[PDB]
Amino acid sequence: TPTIGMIVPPAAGLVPADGARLYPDLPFIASGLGLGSVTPEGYDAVIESVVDHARRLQKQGAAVVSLMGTSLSFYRGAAFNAALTVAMREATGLPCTTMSTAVLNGLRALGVRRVALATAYIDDVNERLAAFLAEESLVPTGCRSLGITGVEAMARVDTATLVDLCVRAFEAAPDSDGILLSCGGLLTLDAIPEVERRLGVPVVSSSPAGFWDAVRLAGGGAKARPGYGRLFDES
Missing domain, CATH: 3.40.50.12500 (Rossmann fold)
Incomplete structure (x- = not known):
């Protein structure tokens, strides 16, 4: 192993x-x-x-x-x-x-071309990641952030809060194939299936x-x- x-x-x-x-x-x-x-x-x-x-x-x-x-x-x-x-x-x-390679490979594996971006951090992270995706011929469709600065370090964001974030990101950009969640704090895994259940579109969380x-x-x-x-x- x-x-x-x-x-x-x-x-x-x-x-x-x-x-x-x-x-x-x-x-x-x-x-x-x-x-x-x-x-x-x-x-x-x-x-x-x-x-x-x-x-x-x-x-x-x-x-x-x-x-x-x-x-x-x-x-x-x-x-x-x-x-x-x-x-x-x-x-x-x-x-x-x-x-970033991992995130590109994940979105590709899922057939995601049009992406809504969500973060628990500041707007600038979504803007940087969107520019990167766009340069790779993916299509950012919208960006939503929570503005919790502590997620650059040790902050943990509640699952329900991350779920609401992703759901509202998608509702504002309902022309998306999927969602990219980045800088979501210490634990994001639990939000993924719940978002997918509620929306019927795939979610890529950058760290997982x-x-x-x-x-x-x-x-x-x-x-x-x-x-x-x-x-x-x-x-």
């Missing part, structure tokens, strides 16, 4: 709880970046830090590495994500991926999608626990 390595933003470097539950029998390890919003040391220093943490995971026995950070994966667009992926792969000799994508990359053919929505039920 291959170990799955994840690079996460906070220095604490914990494996995210919101996804680990999908795969209770698989070993995950994580390495935390601790980077600031801006890094005065410059662009090379940011890339070096990502690459160093990928090496650390390789040395600790990871069989694949996923960059599980929203800003690094999405905020500079798809070409940057691809270049950083190759830099990671060339640094480690391991299959490497990211959260990164788990699914890494497990797929790993090549074991392990299935997620059932009951967490179309993407995980079907793969």
Whole structure:
């Protein structure tokens, strides 16, 4: 059974709880970046830090590495994500991926072209992720946010609150094939099937999608626990 390595933003470097539950029998390890919003040391220093943490995971026995950070994966667009992926792969000799690649793969697997975006965080996250999706020829149809800033760190948002968010996002953009939920706080898994039940359209949650994508990359053919929505039920 291959170990799955994840690079996460906070220095604490914990494996995210919101996804680990999908795969209770698989070993995950994580390495935390601790980077600031801006890094005065410059662009090379940011890339070096990502690459160093990928090496650390390789040395600790990871069989694949996923960059599980929203800003690094999405905020500079798809070409940057691809270049950083190759830099990671060339640094480690391991299959490497990211959260944005995972989200693209999830929406593709579900046949989603027109997407409504929802977040528990600020508008800017939806705008960045929408621009990224649009550049990849998907069609953002609408954006809804809760504005809870603490979700950039340790905040947990109630399932019912996340469900209302996604439902209202879709009702405002009812011409959508599906919904992308990002920055939803510590736990989002429970909202997914409930939203899908109420709307009849699939939901991709960015962090759980990164788990699914890494497990797929790993090549074991392990299935997620059932009951967490179309993407995980079907793969």
